Amino acid sequence: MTLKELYAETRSHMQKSLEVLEHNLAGLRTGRANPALLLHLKVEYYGAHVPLNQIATVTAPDPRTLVVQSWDQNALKAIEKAIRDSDLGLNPSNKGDALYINIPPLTEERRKDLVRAVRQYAEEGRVAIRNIRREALDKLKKLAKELHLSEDETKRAEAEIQKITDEFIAKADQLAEKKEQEILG
Amino acid sequence: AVKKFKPYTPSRRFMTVADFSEITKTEPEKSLVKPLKKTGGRNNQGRITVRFRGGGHKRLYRIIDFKRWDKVGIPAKVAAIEYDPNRSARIALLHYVDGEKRYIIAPDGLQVGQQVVAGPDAPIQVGNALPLRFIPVGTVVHAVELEPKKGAKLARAAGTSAQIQGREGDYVILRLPSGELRKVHGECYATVGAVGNADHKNIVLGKAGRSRWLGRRPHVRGAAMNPVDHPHGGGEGRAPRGRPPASPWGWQTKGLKTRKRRKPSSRFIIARRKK
RNA sequence: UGGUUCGUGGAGCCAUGGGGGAAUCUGGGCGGACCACCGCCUAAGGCUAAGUACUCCGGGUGACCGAUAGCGCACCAGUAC
RNA sequence: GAGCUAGCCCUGGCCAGGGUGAAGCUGGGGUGAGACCCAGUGGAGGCCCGAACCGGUGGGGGAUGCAAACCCCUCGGAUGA
RNA sequence: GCAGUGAACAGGCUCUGGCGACUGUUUACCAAAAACACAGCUCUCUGCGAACUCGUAAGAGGAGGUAUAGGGAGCGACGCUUGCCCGGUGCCGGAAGGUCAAGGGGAGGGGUGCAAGCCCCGAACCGAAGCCCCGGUGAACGGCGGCCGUAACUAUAACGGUCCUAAGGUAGCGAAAUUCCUUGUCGGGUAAGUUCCGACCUGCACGAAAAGCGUAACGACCGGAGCGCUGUCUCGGCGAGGGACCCGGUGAAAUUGAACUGGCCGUGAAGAUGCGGCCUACCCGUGGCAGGACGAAAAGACCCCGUGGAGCUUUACUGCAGCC
RNA sequence: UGAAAUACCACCCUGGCGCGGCUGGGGGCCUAACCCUCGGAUGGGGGGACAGCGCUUGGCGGGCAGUUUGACUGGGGCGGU
RNA sequence: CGAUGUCGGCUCGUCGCAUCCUGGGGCUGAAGAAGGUCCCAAGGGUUGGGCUGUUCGCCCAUUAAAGCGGCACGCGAGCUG
RNA sequence: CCGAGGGUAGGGCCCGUGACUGGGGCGAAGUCGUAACAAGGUAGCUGUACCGGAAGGUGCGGCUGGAU
RNA sequence: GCCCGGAUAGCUCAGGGUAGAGCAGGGGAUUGAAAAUCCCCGUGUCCUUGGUUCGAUUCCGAGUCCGGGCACCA
RNA sequence: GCCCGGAUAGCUCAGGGUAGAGCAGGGGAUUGAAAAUCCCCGUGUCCUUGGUUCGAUUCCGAGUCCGGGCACCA
RNA sequence: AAAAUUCUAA
Ligand SMILES: [Mg+2]
Ligand SMILES: [Mg+2]
Ligand SMILES: [Mg+2]
Ligand SMILES: [Mg+2]
Ligand SMILES: [Mg+2]
Ligand SMILES: [Mg+2]
Ligand SMILES: [Mg+2]
Ligand SMILES: [Mg+2]
Ligand SMILES: [Mg+2]
Ligand SMILES: [Mg+2]
Ligand SMILES: [Mg+2]
Ligand SMILES: [Mg+2]
Ligand SMILES: [Mg+2]
Ligand SMILES: [Mg+2]
Ligand SMILES: [Mg+2]
Ligand SMILES: [Mg+2]
Ligand SMILES: [Mg+2]
Ligand SMILES: [Mg+2]
Ligand SMILES: [Mg+2]
Ligand SMILES: [Mg+2]
Ligand SMILES: [Mg+2]
Ligand SMILES: [Mg+2]
Ligand SMILES: [Mg+2]
Ligand SMILES: [Mg+2]
Ligand SMILES: [Mg+2]
Ligand SMILES: [Mg+2]
Ligand SMILES: [Mg+2]
Ligand SMILES: [Mg+2]
Ligand SMILES: [Mg+2]
Ligand SMILES: [Mg+2]
Ligand SMILES: [Mg+2]
Ligand SMILES: [Mg+2]
Ligand SMILES: [Mg+2]
Ligand SMILES: [Mg+2]
Ligand SMILES: [Mg+2]
Ligand SMILES: [Mg+2]
Ligand SMILES: [Mg+2]
Ligand SMILES: [Mg+2]
Ligand SMILES: [Mg+2]
Ligand SMILES: [Mg+2]
Ligand SMILES: [Mg+2]
Ligand SMILES: [Mg+2]
Ligand SMILES: [Mg+2]
Ligand SMILES: [Mg+2]
Ligand SMILES: [Mg+2]
Ligand SMILES: [Mg+2]
Ligand SMILES: [Mg+2]
Ligand SMILES: [Mg+2]
Ligand SMILES: [Mg+2]
Ligand SMILES: [Mg+2]
Ligand SMILES: [Mg+2]
Ligand SMILES: [Mg+2]
Ligand SMILES: [Mg+2]
Ligand SMILES: [Mg+2]
Ligand SMILES: [Mg+2]
Ligand SMILES: [Mg+2]
Ligand SMILES: [Mg+2]
Ligand SMILES: [Mg+2]
Ligand SMILES: [Mg+2]
Ligand SMILES: [Mg+2]
Ligand SMILES: [Mg+2]
Ligand SMILES: [Mg+2]
Ligand SMILES: [Mg+2]
Ligand SMILES: [Mg+2]
Ligand SMILES: [Mg+2]
Ligand SMILES: [Mg+2]
Ligand SMILES: [Mg+2]
Ligand SMILES: [Mg+2]
Ligand SMILES: [Mg+2]
Ligand SMILES: [Mg+2]
Ligand SMILES: [Mg+2]
Ligand SMILES: [Mg+2]
Ligand SMILES: [Mg+2]
Ligand SMILES: [Mg+2]
Ligand SMILES: [Mg+2]
Ligand SMILES: [Mg+2]
Ligand SMILES: [Mg+2]
Ligand SMILES: [Mg+2]
Ligand SMILES: [Mg+2]
Ligand SMILES: [Mg+2]
Ligand SMILES: [Mg+2]
Ligand SMILES: [Mg+2]
Ligand SMILES: [Mg+2]
Ligand SMILES: [Mg+2]
Ligand SMILES: [Mg+2]
Ligand SMILES: [Mg+2]
Ligand SMILES: [Mg+2]
Ligand SMILES: [Mg+2]
Ligand SMILES: [Mg+2]
Ligand SMILES: [Mg+2]
Ligand SMILES: [Mg+2]
Ligand SMILES: [Mg+2]
Ligand SMILES: [Mg+2]
Ligand SMILES: [Mg+2]
Ligand SMILES: [Mg+2]
Ligand SMILES: [Mg+2]
Ligand SMILES: [Mg+2]
Ligand SMILES: [Mg+2]
Ligand SMILES: [Mg+2]
Ligand SMILES: [Mg+2]
Ligand SMILES: [Mg+2]
Ligand SMILES: [Mg+2]
Ligand SMILES: [Mg+2]
Ligand SMILES: [Mg+2]
Ligand SMILES: [Mg+2]
Ligand SMILES: [Mg+2]
Ligand SMILES: [Mg+2]
Ligand SMILES: [Mg+2]
Ligand SMILES: [Mg+2]
Ligand SMILES: [Mg+2]
Ligand SMILES: [Mg+2]
Ligand SMILES: [Mg+2]
Ligand SMILES: [Mg+2]
Ligand SMILES: [Mg+2]
Ligand SMILES: [Mg+2]
Ligand SMILES: [Mg+2]
Ligand SMILES: [Mg+2]
Ligand SMILES: [Mg+2]
Ligand SMILES: [Mg+2]
Ligand SMILES: [Mg+2]
Ligand SMILES: [Mg+2]
Ligand SMILES: [Mg+2]
Ligand SMILES: [Mg+2]
Ligand SMILES: [Mg+2]
Ligand SMILES: [Mg+2]
Ligand SMILES: [Mg+2]
Ligand SMILES: [Mg+2]
Ligand SMILES: [Mg+2]
Ligand SMILES: [Mg+2]
Ligand SMILES: [Mg+2]
Ligand SMILES: [Mg+2]
Ligand SMILES: [Mg+2]
Ligand SMILES: [Mg+2]
Ligand SMILES: [Mg+2]
Ligand SMILES: [Mg+2]
Ligand SMILES: [Mg+2]
Ligand SMILES: [Mg+2]
Ligand SMILES: [Mg+2]
Ligand SMILES: [Mg+2]
Ligand SMILES: [Mg+2]
Ligand SMILES: [Mg+2]
Ligand SMILES: [Mg+2]
Ligand SMILES: [Mg+2]
Ligand SMILES: [Mg+2]
Ligand SMILES: [Mg+2]
Ligand SMILES: [Mg+2]
Ligand SMILES: [Mg+2]
Ligand SMILES: [Mg+2]
Ligand SMILES: [Mg+2]
Ligand SMILES: [Mg+2]
Ligand SMILES: [Mg+2]
Ligand SMILES: [Mg+2]
Ligand SMILES: [Mg+2]
Ligand SMILES: [Mg+2]
Ligand SMILES: [Mg+2]
Ligand SMILES: [Mg+2]
Ligand SMILES: [Mg+2]
Ligand SMILES: [Mg+2]
Ligand SMILES: [Mg+2]
Ligand SMILES: [Mg+2]
Ligand SMILES: [Mg+2]
Ligand SMILES: [Mg+2]
Ligand SMILES: [Mg+2]
Ligand SMILES: [Mg+2]
Ligand SMILES: [Mg+2]
Ligand SMILES: [Mg+2]
Ligand SMILES: [Mg+2]
Ligand SMILES: [Mg+2]
Ligand SMILES: [Mg+2]
Ligand SMILES: [Mg+2]
Ligand SMILES: [Mg+2]
Ligand SMILES: [Mg+2]
Ligand SMILES: [Mg+2]
Ligand SMILES: [Mg+2]
Ligand SMILES: [Mg+2]
Ligand SMILES: [Mg+2]
Ligand SMILES: [Mg+2]
Ligand SMILES: [Mg+2]
Ligand SMILES: [Mg+2]
Ligand SMILES: [Mg+2]
Ligand SMILES: [Mg+2]
Ligand SMILES: [Mg+2]
Ligand SMILES: [Mg+2]
Ligand SMILES: [Mg+2]
Ligand SMILES: [Mg+2]
Ligand SMILES: [Mg+2]
Ligand SMILES: [Mg+2]
Ligand SMILES: [Mg+2]
Ligand SMILES: [Mg+2]
Ligand SMILES: [Mg+2]
Ligand SMILES: [Mg+2]
Ligand SMILES: [Mg+2]
Ligand SMILES: [Mg+2]
Ligand SMILES: [Mg+2]
Ligand SMILES: [Mg+2]
Ligand SMILES: [Mg+2]
Ligand SMILES: [Mg+2]
Ligand SMILES: [Mg+2]
Ligand SMILES: [Mg+2]
Ligand SMILES: [Mg+2]
Ligand SMILES: [Mg+2]
Ligand SMILES: [Mg+2]
Ligand SMILES: [Mg+2]
Ligand SMILES: [Mg+2]
Ligand SMILES: [Mg+2]
Ligand SMILES: [Mg+2]
Ligand SMILES: [Mg+2]
Ligand SMILES: [Mg+2]
Ligand SMILES: [Mg+2]
Ligand SMILES: [Mg+2]
Ligand SMILES: [Mg+2]
Ligand SMILES: [Mg+2]
Ligand SMILES: [Mg+2]
Ligand SMILES: [Mg+2]
Ligand SMILES: [Mg+2]
Ligand SMILES: [Mg+2]
Ligand SMILES: [Mg+2]
Ligand SMILES: [Mg+2]
Ligand SMILES: [Mg+2]
Ligand SMILES: [Mg+2]
Ligand SMILES: [Mg+2]
Ligand SMILES: [Mg+2]
Ligand SMILES: [Mg+2]
Ligand SMILES: [Mg+2]
Ligand SMILES: [Mg+2]
Ligand SMILES: [Mg+2]
Ligand SMILES: [Mg+2]
Ligand SMILES: [Mg+2]
Ligand SMILES: [Mg+2]
Ligand SMILES: [Mg+2]
Ligand SMILES: [Mg+2]
Ligand SMILES: [Mg+2]
Ligand SMILES: [Mg+2]
Ligand SMILES: [Mg+2]
Ligand SMILES: [Mg+2]
Ligand SMILES: [Mg+2]
Ligand SMILES: [Mg+2]
Ligand SMILES: [Mg+2]
Ligand SMILES: [Mg+2]
Ligand SMILES: [Mg+2]
Ligand SMILES: [Mg+2]
Ligand SMILES: [Mg+2]
């Protein structure tokens, strides 16, 4: 257990919650130049639904348009009906082993809920972080007690946990800050 | 049926005063009253030995006949029934045709002007008094001598009574109000019937004052003192008792049987009380 | 339980709150648990001078003070306050 | 030492004025009879306003004071624990 | 007539939360409160020469009362309610048993004496309370979990596997008088709101009589907003009187090593009128301001030290009253 | 045929009683000690050899009392020693 | 430690320059305007408000600009508290 | 004098809207168990009260639209 | 940081030369199929080291990591 | 360091002539199952050692461990 | 007078 291995465990534990944030931020119709926003979507490959990250290649050349480079042209028609799926309200062109999707300038009705979406995913990330930190102090409550460790020691172990916790918070604040300016841009 | 009040003051919402409807005489018999010495709970040392007593309305003690075996076979007329500030019960004024007047506790149903009388041969009837042995088993009966010629001591409060559960030797078996089954001597008198003013239990002293009138000072919680003052004292902020909750003097108050164990009266108590 | 030098010690003696409880000299206590031998002493009623202790008082005397000393008070002080 | 202060006991005393208008009573309505409603009367209450009186909220002043806890402005209770 | 309670005496108000029902009570002399008290609800002890309290006792108080009464404890009008855990602790019940003191009992040994004897020691066994043991007991003390994985699609888990517990927090409430991260996130109000109100639930560490959530009314209590009005402010001015100032009279105080007591850059026990170098500076007052004299005042009250002291606690130790 | 012979005696063992002797425990009743009570008292009624009190035993025993509650230490504590 | 009164604010300032505006410059990936960076420069200046005890910082509306620091985190025998 | 209207104050109704929330509907190759229809394997329904992941269980009383 | 335990297969465990149990796993059966049941089958330097005995999971020393109890903060 | 005790099979147990008792286990009857019921049987220096009586788990002596009991601790 | 659950389709 011990300290260094508790910090590495912590910094590790907090990273997973941070990357999870980045996942949640790409997969939104951001500035909509993102490729990974369309990378996860329910399709219909041979009756069964599966994620298209085992079906096609999303690549974002220019920002205003986007291509969903596929390798199965009977799946592109399964994808095309799955892009025309309730949500994005986009009119893609298809075939010629091609599948283009141009992106309109985000309206103030969708721009309204985009920022609102970003900050929401933002706070939940932090609560993921903070809830881990409390897990870490309880790991420290026992670990100090179990090991008969000093008092002024177990004080700094707290502050050293705060230092660590204000790490993953500032990045999390910076992630959702940038992703916003791409929506306001 | 106690009297209630429309809430013109916030104490008056739930205050309740007695219906007072059994009372005829609104002033006491002069030959039968005497002053009640008010202690404030202090002994012949002026050291308090009952806390939170004193400050009540003045009281004139009315001389009560607890030993109706005094005048035997002498009938007497129920002159009046009046308020006694020294008990729960109501009192009855007795015009002994003998020419003497007397005060007794007023059983319920007893009506002004009727006759009553002591005597072994007395009628088993509301107000009459007899040795228990000559009272039939299973009669509701109050004001009972505990030992012969040692005066009424049991069921002297409103609505409280006793019942006979049987006989045995020179004793008879009584259910007290507490629910105890006691053996009392047969030659002890008893007034048949139960004490009146049954509503007394359902009086709502309404405010803080009413308790000051009854001579009852405020009762300061153990928790509110300091360890100097009490066991329950001390403790930053509020605190739970933190020990078997105890008296000021330091004895447990949550189920600590306190009666003397070797008390010779125990041989005559068939059963402990109920509930 | 106290007392004695004796703090429970091998703990006698002297004393005595509780229980038990005799005998009249061939009776009784003691001599450091106890036993015996050898000795000493006569408990359970009382009184008794002197030699001893103190200094309100009175006298005598100081390698005692000399008014911030010497008694708190040399003086109208246990007063004034 | 309870001539301050605390409680209790004994015996007396004090609380301008004004506002509110309970139960009860009577009459009217009402019904089989009531419940009830209403009208007048009445005058209850740890009710209201507010002097004495008892307090002592906020503010300023006072700080070798007028004062070893005071003064001014403001405020709380004011028939009752 | 500017103006009529013509002068004097005589509420600013509304909206919205928190705490406590309320009128009261309190730290005489820094706290008036949310604190105590309060009706009211619950547990419990008490059959009377009551329990309890004061006292060595006598004797009182309880009460010239009597289970609708008296004491002890907690909670705190009222509204709806108050869940599980009795393994420990407490209490209550338990004529079995285990242990257990004095005493009894004297198997059996010892001292001594020629001896009759005198003296001590002493096993099994009988032998109370207490304890153990057996139950009951929460408005008695008290306590009310962890981890693995899980659905057409993710995070999510109604389900479910499993470890521990005496048993794992029901209702209701929740960034709260409690939330560390925290100015959490969203909503309101504002031009802008770490406070405030409305929400969410990630309750560091709410929760059901140390009550839980609400509630009309009440409050010199503690928040937030708005109207009215203003010297609170921009930002200050002027005027009044009592002081302050001058004259006459009377005349204190703390403090005071001595004084012939400048600024700066250094130095010095590390913050110099007083030591070095330099600059500045004629003798003596009065009215004014406070930066310095580590100014005054109080043998620091914080911090430590002392085989100092005191109040308080308890399953520290040893006793003592009390009760058995 | 028995390891141990049966008939009468004798001292003893595993037990069971029958009384006698000394002990110990229960239960019940009694009254006169002792307690309470009865305006009446050298008495009546109630309790009753229990309760109460004295000596002695063991216990429960913050209700109260006397005390203890270590040092080192880059202040003390806490961790360590 | 026989006491050097400790956060913040108000009042009054005064100094430093690692300069926020302002004045003088070199270079510039300096067309111009407007910026970046370094150099010189302490004469003057450096707004009002919401929030919270806050310094800080966030936000509002401005401006040439809303500089950073010292003076016992300047300043309580000056005030607040 | 009255008077359109203006303004101050306090009320009533209606509509739009609101963080958050409470259930309701339509979906379907799910997760979960399997209540009703046979006595559906505990006869069902029912008003109520309490509890329970969920359908439901249970207490009291009722109905036959309950079987032998 | 000292005193009671613990370790023994994949997990959970009970036991002076010996080898078990329950069910995760793989099968077989009862069903028209899947259910929960019914039977088999694997699985162990019996934690490392060291010392007793003819031989030790079994006795003991030393630990290791764990349930901790108490004491520490108090 | 006194006292009171027990060692009887896989676990737990009652018992001068003698060797038992229960569920666990194995077989078997019934069971589509869980069981439950039912018939058959073991698993023994009756702790060591030693001593009595004709011999003895049975009485005693002395030992080893565990269990409880007690008081004490310069 | 009963120990035993569940069922992708034109
Ligand atoms: Mg430190
Ligand atoms: Mg009323
Ligand atoms: Mg009345
Ligand atoms: Mg009456
Ligand atoms: Mg008279
Ligand atoms: Mg007297
Ligand atoms: Mg006196
Ligand atoms: Mg009957
Ligand atoms: Mg009753
Ligand atoms: Mg009631
Ligand atoms: Mg009274
Ligand atoms: Mg009361
Ligand atoms: Mg109280
Ligand atoms: Mg207090
Ligand atoms: Mg005191
Ligand atoms: Mg006192
Ligand atoms: Mg105490
Ligand atoms: Mg105390
Ligand atoms: Mg306490
Ligand atoms: Mg307290
Ligand atoms: Mg607290
Ligand atoms: Mg007795
Ligand atoms: Mg002595
Ligand atoms: Mg002695
Ligand atoms: Mg002696
Ligand atoms: Mg002698
Ligand atoms: Mg002689
Ligand atoms: Mg002799
Ligand atoms: Mg003698
Ligand atoms: Mg002698
Ligand atoms: Mg001698
Ligand atoms: Mg001698
Ligand atoms: Mg002799
Ligand atoms: Mg003699
Ligand atoms: Mg004598
Ligand atoms: Mg003599
Ligand atoms: Mg003499
Ligand atoms: Mg001279
Ligand atoms: Mg003199
Ligand atoms: Mg002189
Ligand atoms: Mg002089
Ligand atoms: Mg007085
Ligand atoms: Mg007085
Ligand atoms: Mg009036
Ligand atoms: Mg009226
Ligand atoms: Mg009428
Ligand atoms: Mg008419
Ligand atoms: Mg009528
Ligand atoms: Mg009033
Ligand atoms: Mg008022
Ligand atoms: Mg007057
Ligand atoms: Mg006065
Ligand atoms: Mg005042
Ligand atoms: Mg004042
Ligand atoms: Mg002042
Ligand atoms: Mg005022
Ligand atoms: Mg006033
Ligand atoms: Mg008033
Ligand atoms: Mg009055
Ligand atoms: Mg009064
Ligand atoms: Mg006018
Ligand atoms: Mg005026
Ligand atoms: Mg007015
Ligand atoms: Mg006025
Ligand atoms: Mg007014
Ligand atoms: Mg609220
Ligand atoms: Mg308010
Ligand atoms: Mg309010
Ligand atoms: Mg609040
Ligand atoms: Mg209040
Ligand atoms: Mg008072
Ligand atoms: Mg005060
Ligand atoms: Mg006062
Ligand atoms: Mg004071
Ligand atoms: Mg005050
Ligand atoms: Mg007040
Ligand atoms: Mg007593
Ligand atoms: Mg005393
Ligand atoms: Mg006493
Ligand atoms: Mg006493
Ligand atoms: Mg008495
Ligand atoms: Mg009296
Ligand atoms: Mg009491
Ligand atoms: Mg009470
Ligand atoms: Mg009571
Ligand atoms: Mg309370
Ligand atoms: Mg109720
Ligand atoms: Mg328990
Ligand atoms: Mg218990
Ligand atoms: Mg129990
Ligand atoms: Mg139970
Ligand atoms: Mg008991
Ligand atoms: Mg013991
Ligand atoms: Mg003995
Ligand atoms: Mg003896
Ligand atoms: Mg003896
Ligand atoms: Mg002998
Ligand atoms: Mg011998
Ligand atoms: Mg000899
Ligand atoms: Mg013995
Ligand atoms: Mg015994
Ligand atoms: Mg016993
Ligand atoms: Mg028990
Ligand atoms: Mg138990
Ligand atoms: Mg509860
Ligand atoms: Mg908790
Ligand atoms: Mg899924
Ligand atoms: Mg999944
Ligand atoms: Mg909790
Ligand atoms: Mg909940
Ligand atoms: Mg919250
Ligand atoms: Mg917030
Ligand atoms: Mg709330
Ligand atoms: Mg913390
Ligand atoms: Mg905010
Ligand atoms: Mg906000
Ligand atoms: Mg909004
Ligand atoms: Mg807004
Ligand atoms: Mg806003
Ligand atoms: Mg906001
Ligand atoms: Mg809130
Ligand atoms: Mg809690
Ligand atoms: Mg509680
Ligand atoms: Mg509670
Ligand atoms: Mg409360
Ligand atoms: Mg609340
Ligand atoms: Mg309500
Ligand atoms: Mg309210
Ligand atoms: Mg008030
Ligand atoms: Mg207030
Ligand atoms: Mg307010
Ligand atoms: Mg001004
Ligand atoms: Mg002026
Ligand atoms: Mg002037
Ligand atoms: Mg002058
Ligand atoms: Mg000079
Ligand atoms: Mg230097
Ligand atoms: Mg210098
Ligand atoms: Mg110089
Ligand atoms: Mg100078
Ligand atoms: Mg010089
Ligand atoms: Mg110089
Ligand atoms: Mg010159
Ligand atoms: Mg001057
Ligand atoms: Mg100054
Ligand atoms: Mg001055
Ligand atoms: Mg000073
Ligand atoms: Mg000092
Ligand atoms: Mg000091
Ligand atoms: Mg000091
Ligand atoms: Mg102080
Ligand atoms: Mg000393
Ligand atoms: Mg000391
Ligand atoms: Mg003192
Ligand atoms: Mg402890
Ligand atoms: Mg006594
Ligand atoms: Mg007692
Ligand atoms: Mg005889
Ligand atoms: Mg006998
Ligand atoms: Mg008898
Ligand atoms: Mg008499
Ligand atoms: Mg008499
Ligand atoms: Mg008798
Ligand atoms: Mg006795
Ligand atoms: Mg005594
Ligand atoms: Mg004793
Ligand atoms: Mg003890
Ligand atoms: Mg003490
Ligand atoms: Mg103790
Ligand atoms: Mg001493
Ligand atoms: Mg020590
Ligand atoms: Mg120690
Ligand atoms: Mg130290
Ligand atoms: Mg050393
Ligand atoms: Mg240190
Ligand atoms: Mg050092
Ligand atoms: Mg240091
Ligand atoms: Mg330490
Ligand atoms: Mg230390
Ligand atoms: Mg200092
Ligand atoms: Mg010094
Ligand atoms: Mg000084
Ligand atoms: Mg300071
Ligand atoms: Mg600060
Ligand atoms: Mg600071
Ligand atoms: Mg310069
Ligand atoms: Mg420069
Ligand atoms: Mg630079
Ligand atoms: Mg620069
Ligand atoms: Mg420039
Ligand atoms: Mg340039
Ligand atoms: Mg170039
Ligand atoms: Mg240019
Ligand atoms: Mg250009
Ligand atoms: Mg640069
Ligand atoms: Mg400048
Ligand atoms: Mg300058
Ligand atoms: Mg400047
Ligand atoms: Mg504002
Ligand atoms: Mg503010
Ligand atoms: Mg603030
Ligand atoms: Mg910063
Ligand atoms: Mg900064
Ligand atoms: Mg600022
Ligand atoms: Mg911020
Ligand atoms: Mg510019
Ligand atoms: Mg510019
Ligand atoms: Mg600009
Ligand atoms: Mg700035
Ligand atoms: Mg500004
Ligand atoms: Mg400056
Ligand atoms: Mg600083
Ligand atoms: Mg500074
Ligand atoms: Mg600093
Ligand atoms: Mg400073
Ligand atoms: Mg500053
Ligand atoms: Mg400062
Ligand atoms: Mg200063
Ligand atoms: Mg100063
Ligand atoms: Mg303050
Ligand atoms: Mg009009
Ligand atoms: Mg108009
Ligand atoms: Mg109009
Ligand atoms: Mg309007
Ligand atoms: Mg309107
Ligand atoms: Mg929304
Ligand atoms: Mg659906
Ligand atoms: Mg059903
Ligand atoms: Mg079914
Ligand atoms: Mg069914
Ligand atoms: Mg039903
Ligand atoms: Mg049920
Ligand atoms: Mg049909
Ligand atoms: Mg394993
Ligand atoms: Mg330590
Ligand atoms: Mg402790
Ligand atoms: Mg030994
Ligand atoms: Mg079986
Ligand atoms: Mg089959
Ligand atoms: Mg020992
Ligand atoms: Mg089925
Ligand atoms: Mg299914």
Swiss-Prot record, chain A:
Gene this chain is encoded by: frr
Function: Responsible for the release of ribosomes from messenger RNA at the termination of protein biosynthesis. May increase the efficiency of translation by recycling ribosomes from one round of translation to another.
Organism: Thermus thermophilus (strain ATCC 27634 / DSM 579 / HB8)
Keyword Cell membrane among record annotations: no
NCBIfam families per UniProt: frr
Protein family: Belongs to the RRF family.
Cellular-component GO terms for this entry: cytoplasm
Name of the featured protein: Ribosome-recycling factor
Pfam families: RRF
A GO MF label: ribosomal large subunit binding
Keyword line: Cytoplasm, Protein biosynthesis
Compartment(s) where it occurs, according to its Swiss-Prot or TrEMBL record: Cytoplasm
UniProt GO BP: translational termination
Record SUPFAM superfamilies: Ribosome recycling factor, RRF
From Swiss-Prot, chain B:
Residues covered by region (Disordered): 222-275
GO CC annotation: large ribosomal subunit
UniProt biased composition (Basic and acidic residues): 229-239
Biased composition (Basic residues): 256-275
PROSITE patterns assigned to the protein according to its UniProt record, in alphabetical order: RIBOSOMAL_L2
Function: One of the primary rRNA binding proteins. Required for association of the 30S and 50S subunits to form the 70S ribosome, for tRNA binding and peptide bond formation. It has been suggested to have peptidyltransferase activity; this is somewhat controversial. Makes several contacts with the 16S rRNA (forming bridge B7b) in the 70S ribosome.
Protein family per UniProt: Belongs to the universal ribosomal protein uL2 family.
NCBIfam families with a match to the protein in the record: rplB_bact
Name under which the protein is recorded: Large ribosomal subunit protein uL2
Originating organism: Thermus thermophilus (strain ATCC 27634 / DSM 579 / HB8)
This protein's encoding gene: rplB
